[PDB]
Scaffold this active site. Structure first.
Site, PDB file in Angstrom:
ATOM      1  CE  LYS B  51      -1.459  -8.135   4.536  1.00 10.91           C
ATOM      2  NZ  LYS B  51      -1.932  -7.306   3.419  1.00 10.91           N
ATOM      3  CE1 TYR B 259       3.990  -6.316  -3.211  1.00  6.99           C
ATOM      4  CE2 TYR B 259       6.154  -5.325  -2.783  1.00  6.99           C
ATOM      5  CZ  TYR B 259       4.820  -5.500  -2.447  1.00  6.99           C
ATOM      6  OH  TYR B 259       4.290  -4.853  -1.365  1.00  6.99           O
ATOM      7  CE1 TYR B 285       0.379  -6.685  -1.889  1.00  8.33           C
ATOM      8  CE2 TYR B 285       0.081  -4.380  -1.228  1.00  8.33           C
ATOM      9  CZ  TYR B 285       0.814  -5.565  -1.186  1.00  8.33           C
ATOM     10  OH  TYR B 285       2.025  -5.587  -0.519  1.00  8.33           O
TER      11      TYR B 285
HETATM   12  C1  LIG Z   1      -1.378  -7.674   2.094  1.00 10.19           C
HETATM   13  C2  LIG Z   1      -2.408  -7.231   1.038  1.00 10.19           C
HETATM   14  C3  LIG Z   1      -2.849  -8.112   0.001  1.00 10.19           C
HETATM   15  C4  LIG Z   1      -2.364  -9.551  -0.177  1.00 10.19           C
HETATM   16  O1  LIG Z   1      -2.765 -10.326   0.963  1.00 10.19           O
HETATM   17  P1  LIG Z   1      -1.866 -11.570   1.428  1.00 10.19           P
HETATM   18  O2  LIG Z   1      -2.569 -12.253   2.605  1.00 10.19           O
HETATM   19  O3  LIG Z   1      -0.528 -11.060   1.854  1.00 10.19           O
HETATM   20  O4  LIG Z   1      -1.704 -12.517   0.285  1.00 10.19           O
HETATM   21  C5  LIG Z   1      -3.804  -7.629  -0.931  1.00 10.19           C
HETATM   22  N1  LIG Z   1      -4.293  -6.380  -0.853  1.00 10.19           N
HETATM   23  C6  LIG Z   1      -3.907  -5.512   0.108  1.00 10.19           C
HETATM   24  C7  LIG Z   1      -4.530  -4.095   0.115  1.00 10.19           C
HETATM   25  C8  LIG Z   1      -2.946  -5.902   1.095  1.00 10.19           C
HETATM   26  O5  LIG Z   1      -2.553  -5.013   2.075  1.00 10.19           O
END
Ligand SMILES: *Cc1c(COP(=O)(O)O)cnc(C)c1O
Ligand SMILES: *Cc1c(COP(=O)(O)O)cnc(C)c1O
Ligand SMILES: *Cc1c(COP(=O)(O)O)cnc(C)c1O
Ligand SMILES: *Cc1c(COP(=O)(O)O)cnc(C)c1O
Lengths: 338, 329, 329, 331
Positions: B51, B259, B285
């Site tokens: 991010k 999710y 994630y």
């Molecule tokens: C937000 C995030 C993702 C997924 O990324 P997107 O661009 O939203 O698809 C994966 N891993 C982490 C640690 C995240 O914060």
């Protein structure tokens, strides 16, 4: 001196960055320029931190001997045991950690979040004993080492914080090296370094490294042990042994070891309202987090030193961020509203 | 294409390192060479992560405009809102965060540890519950100028630039390494991380080598979102080609059961990766994308000899809201 | 004296039972006969306890007056406020609780389990930090009429009545058992519990047989509160006497180290009692009076042959806010 | 029948009180009069509950034999194991408990608050398994020189497990005598089944067995219903029931058990809140919250005949609320 004589196993990304703490500096009056050297972001091995820098010099020895298991010890939210666990998995070595609550504290999730949660995920055998089980008295340290042998492995003994170990002070001698190599680019020299101290080989290594150029007494250690006398002595002792190890040609004086005792209270592992205000101020002005056990107390020290004009106007102070942020998870109630 | 046209605010240490995962590769047969690109170690701002790379391109706009407050949104353990809270603090801006439970989960400390805990220490005004519009409005009504940052930075015009840059960075490291990676594994939920990569590698004919691993558990929508953002970003950077649906690859096999919830495979992947490499991943994630990569190598879905670059996007602090699961490792 | 002059709203099942603690007595030498009067099992309203016996004399007034909201105050794991919330619901009254952290204790779930958890389920408006008058005013302004219940119900004109009735009850029970108790051990913090007992037992010459055990860790302030209230209550019930300093016995040796924090003796006392009688006590109050009673016995402070009535005032739900201390027992 | 043939060890204060739930009744239309018999308030032994009423008929046997340790089993927030722990301490017996993760739930303090916390303080040897334990537990006791008295899940699948609640019906008859009327229905939560079984038998005595409305909380209806039936017939033979338990005598509603055992649905939650807020009577998200939900929906659907008098048996279980703190953080 000659530190290059000792092998260094890469466990970090390379030299750690120095960043100005402009907002915090300006917020405190503008009279002192605060910087931070991020040891807290030195590795991909479970967040790394100062202990990981120290470990670079012990692993070669662990490897030279035929050790297949790393054995260490520390309190429940110990940063050291978490780094040993990651380094072990990375090296392909087993890991046994002896742990006990070393703090007068009892959070509901204290033994299941932060550092200790990572060591378990990392595959370490976390031998956490019940309260009243005094591991140090009982010498559980040694039985852990014996159990590995008895099991057919060869242990490498890593004492608390890596500090009281023959090679434990080398890493931070290198830290002083780095700092000089970086001051070369800034065209200036930091007047002071602020560093949190408990088991001592961090500040000890710094003292030996900076003695080499007459700045040993520029290392302002900030005790977080709440047992200043023992801590001061440990740093001194470790610094004299390390000085000898690297061939420094100066005898470390009682005057070369500076350890402020004002910000350690009330006890090891417990923050004071000052520690808390410090953590919040630094985080809210720089986006840089510190913990209630270690770094938050040395941030409280620095900010207080500056506010008390204990720093000669115009000075450049280099704050060494040693890590420890994961421990914040064990003090959730305190920060429930920030 | 021309990415160099958009201003990039520095919020990271610089290009992120690429490390070999020698032991893990050996553990799975050694027929595939695995590596990891560490986006999780890109910044000194509250651990950063993907991010943060995305945000470097949104910040100049927030600044160009007289914005004094950063406003974002995410689930209780959102990594995004935590990185926005740290960037705000670092930039001297106020921070309002709209947090809601976007997961069918209810741990005792869910809203007191990990990411959300950091956001509160970092000074953000954490509002637990259209909450979105209401937040933005309150900022103005309070006499401030807010910069709206959508979920994961993904549905933002500037949201896909960060990872077009990632692709750029990778060719430059490939030059240095004297070789090129055959595939890239990346976790995908809101979409602009993979979309950015898709565009960035379409530039050298490797968009379809970017293997997305769904973690939303709503593949159809995620796939469309990555598609849309990618096409839009390509337009933004002047890509010579029109992004096609075949440029977007999204594996749906590892997102179960929902999710924010790990499956047993997710936990096994997290444990194997941590224990072979010392590299941690989370149950929301990265553990799912790591699970996917491992499963792909194991089913022999990668040709023998391939070089796979795992993009580790961060997320480790959320491990704290799943303490019972890992009580014994 | 005539307690009968005052209305009592039934909030309990009836007289609380007295049980012998033969195992703990035997364990401690068999020289002192220990009993327990279970105030902790006195009601169907969220576990009740001593505060509930107190509220029976206050409710009539709240009702006489046209009050529609009960408003009280206490620490985060306050027993008092949980009982007020339950009494309120049962009466069809609203409830506003002012909860502040009155203890130098931090536990991740301290404000989410035990007593405070029940007060929220019971529908009370739990306000976490003069907050007191602020709350009362908010009730009026809101259009409702509040009945103010001070901390622990103690410093109130009707606050001591409940335990004057306790002494009366004990007398009636001694008539049934065919013997009298020589002493009563009771935990004291806000004071009207022991105050009521002092006034009730002064009536048959045993005020000094009521052995209060301080749990506030502020002995002087607590001793004064007990005395003050005992004097006020004695005037109310028509006791033919002045309450003298010799009538108020408050042991100070067991409150350590602070209000709300147990010492090692507290913990050992909670474990011993639970393991010999199956009767649980808490680390804030009862565990401290239990520690006191066990120690008095161990030191030979009770004459051989004494029958000691331990008054178990409740408080067990608070155990949940101290989970880590008891994780292994 | 003759329940008096079997000894009963006193672990309770005495008969449990029946209370009218007037506010909840009126809140629902005033067409059905709701009451609660407080089994949750029957003992000074770590809060007690229905399991403690059952234990009164098993302990005499444990004692008759030379048992010195009570061994039982249950989920992490089991109410049964906590009462066994309290009863053992009170009796001067050791206690070994086999706790397993019987719920797909993973709360941070799940194994450290509520029932399991009390068992440890009560001195029980609490045995958990990382994410045959039963036989190892029993053997470990013999090996140590002791003699274990085995108490199966919920006390149900045991020869004396249904007597406790036969007596419950006997108690209710005595109270109805003082009331001058008979309850038309009884609502009871059922999982391992010997609570409802004892009731079915006790009320069969006066043709009201099919008036006992069990509410399933196991999420395994068929299996629970069958176990209630079997335990009822076995118990009926134990006490001399002059009638036979018919399949139709065992009523078990399955609509409120969802989604799984140990997990509440939103209806469970509203029911806990509604009942707590109208009566000051707490129920848990695993058991009582579900039978309460059942009774409320029944009333709301006009399933009870207007004017009926329904007796809700509150079996206990409230300490388990501590294991679901996040869902009640705001009430
Ligand atoms: C937000 C995030 C993702 C997924 O990324 P997107 O661009 O939203 O698809 C994966 N891993 C982490 C640690 C995240 O914060
Ligand atoms: C160990 C540690 C310290 C103190 O280092 P010593 O060498 O033991 O004095 C400071 N901060 C953190 C985060 C640590 O882990
Ligand atoms: C309030 C309380 C006390 C102390 O009683 P006071 O009347 O306030 O002196 C003791 N035990 C418990 C369980 C309490 O709730
Ligand atoms: C065990 C239990 C039940 C179900 O009783 P069974 O006899 O097993 O059917 C219901 N409520 C509570 C509180 C329990 O402990």
């Amino acid at each position: 001196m000659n530190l290059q004589r000792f092998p260094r196993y890469p466990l970090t990304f390379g030299p750690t960055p120095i960043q100005p703490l402009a907002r915090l500096s300006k917020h405190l009056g503008g009279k002192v320029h605060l910087y931070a050297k991020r040891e807290d972001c030195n590795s991909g091995l479970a967040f790394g931190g100062n202990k990981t820098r120290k470990l670079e010099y012990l692993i070669p020895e662990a490897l030279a001997q035929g050790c297949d298991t790393l054995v260490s010890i520390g309190g429940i939210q110990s940063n050291q045991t978490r780094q040993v666990a990651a380094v072990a998995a990375h090296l392909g070595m087993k890991c046994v950690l002896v742990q006990e609550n070393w703090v007068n504290y009892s959070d509901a999730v204290y033994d299941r979040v932060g550092n200790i949660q990572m060591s378990r995920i990392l595959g370490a055998d976390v031998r956490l004993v019940p309260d009243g089980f005094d591991i140090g008295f009982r010498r559980s340290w040694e039985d852990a080492l014996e159990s590995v042998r008895a099991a057919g492995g060869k242990p490498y003994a890593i004492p608390a914080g890596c500090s009281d170990h023959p090679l434990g002070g080398l890493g931070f001698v290198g830290f002083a090296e780095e700092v000089r190599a970086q001051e070369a680019e800034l065209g200036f020299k930091f007047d002071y370094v602020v560093v949190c101290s408990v088991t001592g080989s961090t500040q000890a290594g710094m003292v030996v490294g900076f003695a080499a150029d007459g700045r040993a007494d520029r290392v302002i250690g900030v005790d977080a042990s709440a047992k200043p006398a023992q801590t001061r002595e440990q740093i001194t002792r470790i610094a004299r042994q390390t000085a000898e190890k690297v061939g420094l040609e100066r005898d470390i004086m009682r005057a070369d070891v500076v350890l402020d005792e004002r910000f350690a209270g009330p006890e090891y592992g417990l923050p004071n309202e000052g520690t808390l205000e410090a953590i919040r101020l630094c985080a809210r002005t720089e986006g840089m987090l510190t913990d209630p056990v270690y770094e938050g107390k040395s941030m409280h020290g620095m900010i207080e030193m500056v506010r008390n004009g204990e720093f000669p106007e115009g000075s450049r102070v280099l704050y060494a961020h040693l890590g420890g942020v994961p421990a914040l998870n064990g003090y959730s109630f305190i920060f429930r509203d920030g």
